């Protein structure tokens, strides 16, 4: 209101005391701000990590000690640069190099020549993503000097049933020969030999024109099939087409597994099929194509 001069001194010091008191708290606060900064320097922790061990292929890495399935870098002999891959490693010490995966339909497989050559999709440590490693890489892995390779196809329906198809002496040629697919023989498997063709009973040469051994690779922008039309374009995918196919794991992902002649625009069966195990109008739910040295397979 209007205190006395006698009060001015008691008060005058009261302010100086909290003022200094304040400057102190601040000195310590600024300090604490410093300690906080030291805690906010690291980036967010990425769950996905790539393993250190590398080699010519997954089996080579498994031999070097690796034990768990994950992302690794491999560098085949003829490979100019190294590249990332997904290795599946079992308890027996087998290291498969996976080059194809289907499981949800999240990845569009209607890609072009370069895309199928260089690869697309994503690699995950948990092996829960869809992808195509890339023709050139597959060629490089499967044609290392004096190393006979084997291919295993894994299928799963929408009822938890899984089947297999093995092929000995699996090989994929160079771009110069349009990444032609070849193998010595069907190594057996409860999924059946779709690569050998399948009699659809709609013609005499059905079988012959649905076989895949010896077939080059085809994409909409690069036709190399044994049909005057364009399989890859009509079926909208990239694959070793004949006229057209008996086994088609890079086809359109149909939810539920069951689809019809109506589902498609042209009418042709363009799903993820494998005739020797299910009808043309049954697209698988999960798919995986992996390779490993033949000597390693039994």
């Amino acid at each position: 209101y209007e205190a006395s001069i006698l009060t001015h001194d008691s008060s005058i010091r009261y302010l100086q005391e909290i003022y200094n008191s304040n400057n102190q708290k601040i000195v310590n606060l600024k300090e604490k701000v410093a300690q906080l900064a030291a805690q906010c320097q690291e980036p967010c922790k990425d769950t996905v990590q790539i393993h250190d061990i590398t080699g010519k292929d997954c089996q080579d890495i498994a031999n070097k000690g690796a034990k768990q399935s994950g992302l690794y870098f491999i560098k085949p002999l003829k490979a100019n640069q190294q590249f990332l891959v997904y290795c599946e490693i079992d308890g027996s010490g087998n290291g498969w190099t996976v080059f194809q995966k289907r499981l949800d339909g999240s990845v569009d497989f209607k890609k072009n020549w370069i895309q199928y050559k260089e690869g697309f999709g994503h690699l995950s440590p948990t092996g829960t993503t869809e992808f195509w490693l890339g023709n050139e890489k597959i060629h490089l892995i499967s044609t290392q000097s004096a190393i006979p390779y084997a291919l295993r196809v894994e299928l799963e329906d929408w009822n938890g049933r899984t089947s297999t198809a093995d092929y000995a002496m699996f090989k994929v040629g160079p771009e110069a020969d349009k990444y032609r697919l070849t193998y010595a023989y069907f190594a057996g498997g409860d999924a059946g030999d779709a690569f050998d063709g399948f009699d659809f009973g709609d013609d005499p040469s059905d079988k012959f024109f649905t076989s895949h051994n010896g077939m080059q690779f085809s994409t909409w922008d690069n036709d190399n099939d044994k049909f005057e039309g364009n399989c890859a374009e009509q079926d909208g995918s990239g694959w070793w087409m004949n006229k057209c196919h008996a086994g088609h794991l890079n086809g359109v992902y149909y939810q539920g597994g069951t689809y019809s002649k109506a589902s498609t625009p042209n009418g042709y069966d363009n799903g993820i099929i494998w005739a020797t195990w299910k009808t043309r109008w049954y697209s698988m739910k999960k798919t995986t194509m992996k390779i490993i040295p033949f000597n390693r397979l039994t």
Binding site: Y19, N22, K30, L36, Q39
Partner: protein
Amino acid sequence: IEKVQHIQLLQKNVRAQLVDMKRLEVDIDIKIRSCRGSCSRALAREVDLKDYEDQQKQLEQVIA
């Protein structure tokens, strides 16, 4: 006199402590937000310079 020149000191001591605090407020806002890309979460907040500025003027209205 004695009491007199004591005030001029606190007026400049506060005028400065204001500018300083106003700055610490900005600094802290910035440093806290820089934790969003490191820690689990960053404290949600907002700055109010208004208060700091109203007082800085409210003060000059006494150094007069």
